[PDB]
Amino acid sequence: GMSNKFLGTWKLVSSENFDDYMKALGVGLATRKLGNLAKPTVIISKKGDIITIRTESTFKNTEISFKLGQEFEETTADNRKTKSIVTLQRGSLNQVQRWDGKETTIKRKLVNGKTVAECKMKGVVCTRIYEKV
Ligand SMILES: CCCCCCCCCCCCCCCC(=O)O
Ligand SMILES: [Cl-]
Ligand SMILES: [Mg+2]
Ligand SMILES: [Mg+2]
């Protein structure tokens, strides 16, 4: 049920409050330094019911494949091992990651042709805007 408008190759154009988001995930200073400098490309694709989100950067690459509503094991860019679930709520693609009794959410939604990712951890909100390419 995912909008095919999500599908494509997307480039970060802006990021707000990423440091405090990373810090709340427990990312350490040197890694945050490089994370803040990174300008990743996110590639969303679909094969049958299986959706893939691939993030590419000089510093770290990541890739998850999933079916909506089906928990799956994830390795995040900061090397957290999580149980994740991705869902559709109101045209938004909502990812939840759980590990060690913690939880963070990344909500990706289409806004005037951009993908806007809202990343929440413990009341810290970070917003990152992606342009299709
Ligand atoms: C892949 C760029 C990040 C580089 C590594 C720095 C620490 C990662 C922090 C947690 C993962 C961030 C997820 C951001 C969501 C997004 O914008 O796609
Ligand atoms: Cl980069
Ligand atoms: Mg802040
Ligand atoms: Mg700050």
CB of 113 within 8 A of CB of 130?
no
The neighbourhood of ligand 4, an ion, using CB within 5 A, equals: 19-20
The neighbourhood of ligand 3, an ion, using CB within 5 A, equals: 17, 20
Structure tokens at 81: 């091992």
Say which residues have a Cβ less than 8 Å from residue 78's Cβ, sequence separation at least 6. Answer: 22, 25, 26, 27, 31, 35, 60
Q: What's the resolution in A?
A: 2.0
* Mutational test site, ligand 1, from 53, 55, 84, max ligand atoms within 8 Å of CB: 55
Task: Please tell me if the CB atom of residue 87 comes closer than 6 angstroms to any atom of ligand 1.
Answer: no
| Domain residue extents for the chain | 1-133
Q: Containing H/E element for 22? A: helix 18-24
Strand partners, 16: 127
Strand partners, 62: 55
For residue 33, give the DSSP letter.
H
For residue 12, give the DSSP letter.
E
Residue nearest to atom 12 of ligand 1 (CA): 77
Q: Experimental method for this entry? A: X-ray
HSE-up (13 A, CA, CB side) for residue 99: 17
